[PDB]
């Protein structure tokens, strides 16, 4: 099932006010299934297990850069339905495409 956008990222944890990261080589991507729904998933590049698979409709989410993280390229998939924040730190070698991937995420989530 072809992907629509993919890029190496890892995960992080939001304890209280404190976003803590995860060490695994993960990957973020967006996939369209045969019934057309748009999924936002994250899978373990190591084991290959897909730990996250969310069906996303226009206006569900924003995928944004996180300013409070200087030491990493932290992005947050955030929901208007509540306090579901989902944190990811870019694991790509070159930062050249961080911002294109951020745009294309938002684009496919909200313009499918």
């Amino acid at each position: 099932n072809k992907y629509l956008v993919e890029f190496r990222a890892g995960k992080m944890s939001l304890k209280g006010t404190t976003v803590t990261p995860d060490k695994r080589k993960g990957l973020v991507y967006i996939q369209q299934t045969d019934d057309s729904l748009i999924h936002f998933c994250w899978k373990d590049r190591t084991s290959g297990n897909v730990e996250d698979d969310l069906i996303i409709f226009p206006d569900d989410c924003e995928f944004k850069r996180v300013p409070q993280c200087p030491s990493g390229r932290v992005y947050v998939l955030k929901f208007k339905a509540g306090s579901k924040r989902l944190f990811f730190w870019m694991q790509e070698p070159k930062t050249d495409q961080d911002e294109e991937h951020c745009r294309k995420v938002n684009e496919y989530l909200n313009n499918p």
Partner: peptide
């Protein structure tokens, strides 16, 4: 190669 994890940061 591949970046190092970020240091924990407060979320605001």
């Amino acid at each position: 190669q591949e970046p190092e994890p970020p240091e924990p940061f407060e979320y605001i």
